[PDB]
Amino acid sequence: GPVWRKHYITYRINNYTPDMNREDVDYAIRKAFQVWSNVTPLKFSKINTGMADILVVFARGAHGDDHAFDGKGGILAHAFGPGSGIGGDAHFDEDEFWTTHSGGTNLFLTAVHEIGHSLGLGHSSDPKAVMFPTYKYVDINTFRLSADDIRGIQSLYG
Ligand SMILES: [Ca+2]
Ligand SMILES: [Ca+2]
Ligand SMILES: [Ca+2]
Ligand SMILES: [Zn+2]
Ligand SMILES: [Zn+2]
Numbered sequence: 776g777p778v779w780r781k782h783y784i785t786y787r788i789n790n791y792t793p794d795m796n797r798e799d800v801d802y803a804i805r806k807a808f809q810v811w812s813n814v815t816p817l818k819f820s821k822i823n824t825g826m827a828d829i830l831v832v833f834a835r836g837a838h839g840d841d842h843a844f845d846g847k848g849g850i851l852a853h854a855f856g857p858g859s860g861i862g863g864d865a866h867f868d869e870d871e872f873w874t875t876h877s878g879g880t881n882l883f884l885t886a887v888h889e890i891g892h893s894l895g896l897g898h899s900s901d902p903k904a905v906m907f908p909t910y911k912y913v914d915i916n917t918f919r920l921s922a923d924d925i926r927g928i929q930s931l932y933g
Contacts, residue, residue, distance in 0.1 A: 776856055777857045786828065786829035786831060789830050792833040842876050845868075852865065856895050862891060867885065901921055
């Protein structure tokens with residue numbers, strides 16, 4: 776499928792969930808980009824104005840794309856594959872309760888998976904994989920990409 780054809784990719788946090796401290800959102804998203812930068816030639820920078828490649832949005836219900844959120848539970852987040860405009864953009868359902876920990880829905884773990892999609896990855900059938908379709912909490916300290924994820928992103932970049 777489509778991939779970014781450049782090595783420097785920008786993101787921009789369009790708005791912040793009131794569920795968390797600002798700095799914890801910055802840090803969760805940062806760390807999630809770091810997971811993918813560790814295993815590709817990509818570099819990610821946060822920008823604050825202008826157009827970024829990857830816009831990070833917290834939104835609820837119908838939010839102007841053709842993919843409405845469904846209130847609490849069900850769909851947690853989604854993201855569009857690489858491309859201009861909405862391409863790359865990662866959207867997080869505000870009707871979830873985002874956290875740094877095991878409570879509600881972990882921002883970090885979720886953003887690692889959605890970013891995988893922003894990068895062009897689809898879903899893995901391996902329950903060990905971060906690209907597995909279902910959200911499973913794991914200790915954010917114990918977190919690793921599976922062989923399958925690494926293999927999938929390396930078939931796309933690097
Ligand atoms: Ca975009
Ligand atoms: Ca939802
Ligand atoms: Ca919320
Ligand atoms: Zn959306
Ligand atoms: Zn997914």
